[PDB]
């Protein structure tokens, strides 16, 4: 029973394809932790996005509907926009 991540996510690459890919490395000490992924339809193809290491990047694929893709939570949530 994992718990949400309290750290930030640093972006590395965003591409296209009818879906988006996002590569993010994690800054934190509380790993392994669930990735707070939200869209503001908006769906996450990646099942159970989880960090398990600070050094290791994570691949996240999302199917957005213009809205922001918010990976993270709190004062340092990574906010992006797409169409």
């Amino acid at each position: 029973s994992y718990v949400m991540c309290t750290g930030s996510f640093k972006l590395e690459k965003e591409v296209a394809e009818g879906t988006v890919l996002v590569q993010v490395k994690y800054e934190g000490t509380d790993a392994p932790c669930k990735i707070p992924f939200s869209s503001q339809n908006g769906r996450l193809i990646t099942a159970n996005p989880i960090v398990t290491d600070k050094e290791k990047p994570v691949n996240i694929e999302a199917e957005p509907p213009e809205s922001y893709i918010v990976v993270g939570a709190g004062e340092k949530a990574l906010k992006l926009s797409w169409f």
Partner: antibody, heavy 122, light 108 residues
Framework: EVQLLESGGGLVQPGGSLRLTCATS????????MSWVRQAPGKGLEWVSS????????YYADSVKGRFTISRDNSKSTLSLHMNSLRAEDSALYFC???????????????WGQGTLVTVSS | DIQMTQSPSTLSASVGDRVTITCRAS??????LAWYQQKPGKAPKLLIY???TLKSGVPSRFSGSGSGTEFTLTISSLQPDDFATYYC?????????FGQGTKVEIKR
């Protein structure tokens, strides 16, 4: 407008239990992460626990892990701290804290209560 | 865990002088540092977050700089209601930890 009132503190013997409650009024309790931070006498601040604002994620300081549990009531808009196996070092002023923004994990302590004292001693 | 250390522990300075406090982190916390002020008898008050962003209502004589491992909190012109103990807290990830505190004294 944001006001927090902690209650439930007092004297309790070692190995005993206690339960603090934090009553809130000026904000949507649902959307915010809520925290417990303690200050022992003549010392600094020590974060105790955090209850996330996006799910039921709970976070605990190492010294406290396994002994306290932070619970949330979004009906009465109250934040409870259940303390068990209390130790001498747990004696302190217990503050209830509010995160600066909604839908967070308790990064900041934007609005504090006036505290509730906890003395652990036989 | 990340352990913060403040410098100096106690500080004496007269009203109107420009005074500085330092926070060092055991490891890089990027820009995820906040500064709280605590008056005697009262609860802490968040002054700064994300290194340099001022909380609403805080006078502009306060200003936070630094990044990575070293951070500084600066008071431009010390004032009467500015004597207190200042803590710094990283919010890089849990556990959240504070510095030991810097109690600033009004010289007279």
């Amino acid at each position: 407008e944001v006001q927090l009132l902690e209650s439930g503190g007092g004297l309790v013997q070692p190995g005993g239990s206690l339960r603090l409650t934090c009553a809130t009024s000026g904000f949507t309790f649902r959307d915010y992460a809520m925290s417990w931070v303690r200050q022992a006498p003549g010392k600094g601040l020590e974060w105790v626990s955090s209850y996330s604002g996006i799910d039921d994620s709970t976070y605990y300081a190492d010294s406290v892990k396994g002994r306290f549990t932070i619970s949330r009531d979004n009906s009465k808009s109250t934040l409870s701290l259940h303390m068990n196996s209390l130790r001498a070092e747990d004696s302190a002023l217990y503050f209830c804290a509010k995160d600066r923004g909604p839908r967070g994990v308790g990064e900041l302590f934007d609005s504090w209560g006036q505290g509730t004292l906890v003395t652990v001693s036989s | 865990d990340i352990q913060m250390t403040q410098s100096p522990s106690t500080l004496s300075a007269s009203v109107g002088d420009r005074v500085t406090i330092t926070c060092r982190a055991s490891q890089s916390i990027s820009k995820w540092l906040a500064w709280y002020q605590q008056k005697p008898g009262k609860a802490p008050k968040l002054l700064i977050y994300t290194t340099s962003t001022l909380k609403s209502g805080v006078p502009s004589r306060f200003s936070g700089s630094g990044s990575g491992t070293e951070f500084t909190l600066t008071i431009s012109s010390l004032q009467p209601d500015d004597f207190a103990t200042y803590y710094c807290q990283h919010f890089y990830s849990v556990p959240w930890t504070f510095g030991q505190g810097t109690k600033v004294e009004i010289k007279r």
